[PDB]
């Protein structure tokens, strides 16, 4: 694939994804299974005014992956931009 046909296909795939997104169910359960399990994400940073997504990632991390995180010694960090600014920006309180 030349990197112009691939760009065209990516454009006309993104278009359909965004066009059908608002008329299709949001599969957030399988989405956070992707980045918590397949990627083994250590820092989850939520961008937004409230910790909506961060709270529901923490709930997912207790309902599942509790034994998974302990066995693999994963230290997950769930940071919301609105409240965990010091940890996101690396400005610890002395």
């Amino acid at each position: 694939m030349k990197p112009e046909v691939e760009q065209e296909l990516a454009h006309i795939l993104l278009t359909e994804l965004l066009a059908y997104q608002f008329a299709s169910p949001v599969r957030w359960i399988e989405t956070q299974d992707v980045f918590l399990k397949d990627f083994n994400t250590e820092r989850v940073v939520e961008i937004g005014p409230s910790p909506t997504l961060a709270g529901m990632a923490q709930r997912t991390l207790k309902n599942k992956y509790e034994s998974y995180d302990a066995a693999l010694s994963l230290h997950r960090e769930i940071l919301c931009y609105s409240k965990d600014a010091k940890e996101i920006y690396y400005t610890p309180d002395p």
Partner: peptide, 23 residues
Amino acid sequence: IIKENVKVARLAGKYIPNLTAKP
């Protein structure tokens, strides 16, 4: 959405859509 601004390298394997919960 202009095709010239897509930049597939910034999307492949990193963006997880809501419609398809797959990278």
